Amino acid sequence: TVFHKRYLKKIRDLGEGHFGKVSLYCYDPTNDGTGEMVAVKALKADAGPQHRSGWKQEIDILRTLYHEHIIKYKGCCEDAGAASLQLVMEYVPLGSLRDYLPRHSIGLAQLLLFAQQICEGMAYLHAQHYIHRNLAARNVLLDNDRLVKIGDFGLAKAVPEGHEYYRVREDGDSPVFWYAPECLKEYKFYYASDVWSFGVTLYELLTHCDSSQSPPTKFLELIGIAQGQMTVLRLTELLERGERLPRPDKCPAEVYHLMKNCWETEASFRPTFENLIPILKTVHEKYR
Ligand SMILES: N#Cc1cc(Cl)c(C(=O)Nc2ccnc(NC(=O)[C@H]3C[C@H]3F)c2)c(Cl)c1
């Protein structure tokens, strides 16, 4: 599917993705204003060959993904400037949960439904032999009060059929506070590593994405802000000692134990996304 730059009418900037920026456009070829609203992710004009290789990979992954809980791929636009492809995706009306939740007091049952939907989209992603590597509330988008979709796949990678993990590099932009100990220490990203990130995401939902309760805030309170290059090493140490993010206010005990099960040190002791779907359906049923 092809989109024309001449028919794209910019409304506002939505935010910063991974390789570039996301903007809100109205694709209006008729010029009457009845055109559809699109979210266009563009690669920055000054990006090197390393980011351009990863950007093409992001588009290839999104194109091959088709799920109700994964952001819909609409097409691509011919970007004459920067000489790259602009990723055209569906506009999710309510936005990220990190922005929506601190302003809208959402019930426990609805939060548990979102977690179930995240697991539904993630199990499909894993069945397609892909890892997300960036599962967080800022990347989970809301369509309506009952529908959730996974948005940013900038760090998503394909795990080969034979292998069970993917070896990662030493990067500054890595969401370390959402990462399992095997990602920080051995630089290995398993399917079980995404489950750890879900637990951290579930923690964010229960806190209603309160920035003073966020994982970088709580972990740096335990690490300390003056530890040189040893922030990640100190983070690895406390996780090895069994220290975890605290139980959120008004969060049920069994739900916190499920969060702690997603946060098991040994990756094999962690439930798969397919294991979490019947569980979260039952948990949501109890609180609805
Ligand atoms: N970090 C990060 C980060 C930054 C951005 Cl921009 C995105 C993203 O793709 N956001 C989108 C995409 C489509 N619609 C909205 N919808 C809205 O923004 C609705 C509020 C109204 F504009 C937000 C993601 Cl998934 C992660």
Q: Where do the domains of the chain lie? A: 1-91, 92-288
Does the C-beta of 151 come closer than 6 Å to ligand 1? yes
The residue contributing the CA closest to ligand 1 atom 11 is: 95
Task: Give this entry's resolution in angstroms.
Answer: 2.5
Amino acid identity of residue 156, one-letter, is A
CA of 222 to the centre of ligand 1 (A): 31
Write down the experimental method used for this entry.
X-ray
**What's phi and psi for 287, nearest 5 deg?**
-90, -5
Determine the atom of ligand 1 nearest the C-alpha atom of 152: 25
CATH class of 92-288: mainly alpha
Domain formed by 1-91, architecture: 2-Layer Sandwich (3.30)
Q: How far, in whole angstroms, is CA 27 from its chain's centroid? A: 26
What gap in Å lies between CA 200 and CA 169, rounded to an integer? 22
Candidate from 22, 58, 87, 94 with most ligand 1 atoms within 8 A of CB, to mutate? 22
Q: Are strands 20-27 and 36-43 parallel, antiparallel or unpaired?
A: antiparallel
Does the C-beta of 150 come closer than 6 Å to ligand 1? no
User: Which residues are registered as beta bridge partners of 36?
Assistant: 27
What gap in Å lies between CA 263 and CA 257, rounded to an integer? 9
